[PDB]
Design a protein around this ligand. Structure first.
Ligand code: 6GC
Ligand code: 6GC
Lengths: 208, 208
């Protein structure tokens, strides 16, 4: 029931660079994921002006940060517009082809990994801290899907039979052994305050 | 043939603040407009993956900067997705209600006008340099419209009978008398290099 796909060549190369480069300031992953959540929330909010029934699958527009020391996971949940199967498999890979090329050029021109979000590919900064990422997503117009990748040049997509979520996206970061700092309450608080303080949606940091 | 509308109260108040505050670093207007053009170009590019006929109204995705010393205008043109009448009159005012409130709060909390784009209302930084703004826009699904405002709490919209443009948005900044520096080639070049160097579309600075 599980489809396996190869990444575009440029994305696979971006992911290797992110995993292999020595770069200490890994905490920027969180801002990039919160930023993408915010954009997804903007999208469903705007669509709902012209069609209030888009919020039948959920009225609240918000972001939850959920650390889990047992599973060694950090989960970022939003109730944004979600993603279709086509988004996961094809559409986002395609726009990320040019953004990756632009980004990798700038890095040669001296730029630093922290500028990744200006090229549209800030999601892949998750692999600074995660050995595996799972994405569960639900768009009004499609079914619930699980996307997963451990960054070896391939990703999987399946229909998700797990617990339904209504509308939005959940990003489950399976953290590397030496990156458990991002499960601690004061570390996450520090990072959100420093990088994400002007997001226009509630950000709730769950306690354990 | 011309409809006159009142701005939302919060936007009218944002515009007065932008016009009345002493703030020397006015050049940030250009980055905000180029940023919105880029977002509009992203939108039509993405829509065209799932429906290549959206580019029948124009294949090229680009940004032109056109100074005109005679008319004292600076025009920013893009071939992005364009805006519907509903966008101009109602939809963008509504999302800009919360962004304005958020922004004006931050300014009390010390923030500075240069952060306006983080709240979604960066367009209104045009009134740092313009006494009047005209917006001509064409969306695939609607007709060509002219929006105009001289920031006295009202704006006008009409159907544009002028020369058709295909798809996109043109922003015509009627500059204040003491802001002609933004018509000079070396000044515009300087600003684009400093603030807009990583935009993923061609930016062409027309000569006079
Ligand atoms: C193929 C792998 C994808 C990686 N992921 C999960 C993301 O980028 C990502 C995407 C969304 C998302 N839902 N709906 C939507 O439009 N977006 C979206 C937002 C911003 C840029 C692009 C987007 F598609 C989100 O809410 C959270 C995310 O972390
Ligand atoms: C009511 C007054 C509006 C002010 N203007 C002209 C802008 O903000 C503005 C808007 C667009 C635009 N075309 N299509 C589209 O989606 N956008 C858009 C882009 C970014 C945020 C919001 C948007 F609607 C542009 O290409 C250039 C602009 O300067």
């Amino acid at each position: 029931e599980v489809e396996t796909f190869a990444f575009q060549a440029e994305i696979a190369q971006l992911m290797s660079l992110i995993i292999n480069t020595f770069y200490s300031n890994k905490e920027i992953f969180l801002r990039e994921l919160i930023s993408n959540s915010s954009d997804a929330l903007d999208k469903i909010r705007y669509e709902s002006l012209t069609d209030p029934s888009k919020l039948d699958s959920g009225k609240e527009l918000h972001i939850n940060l959920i650390p889990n020391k047992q599973d060694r996971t950090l989960t970022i949940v939003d109730t944004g517009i979600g993603m279709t199967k086509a988004d996961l498999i094809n559409n986002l890979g395609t726009i990320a082809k040019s953004g990756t090329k632009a980004f990798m050029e700038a890095l040669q021109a001296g730029a630093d990994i922290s500028m990744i979000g200006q090229f549209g590919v800030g999601f892949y900064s998750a692999y600074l801290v995660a050995e595996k990422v799972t994405v569960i997503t639900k768009h009004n117009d499609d079914e619930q899907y699980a996307w997963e990748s451990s960054a070896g040049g391939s990703f999987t997509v399946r229909t998700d039979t797990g617990e339904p979520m209504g509308r939005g996206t959940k990003v489950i970061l399976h953290l590397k052994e030496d990156q458990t700092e991002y499960l601690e309450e004061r570390r996450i608080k520090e990072i959100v305050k420093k990088h994400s303080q002007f997001i226009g949606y509630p950000i709730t940091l769950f306690v354990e």
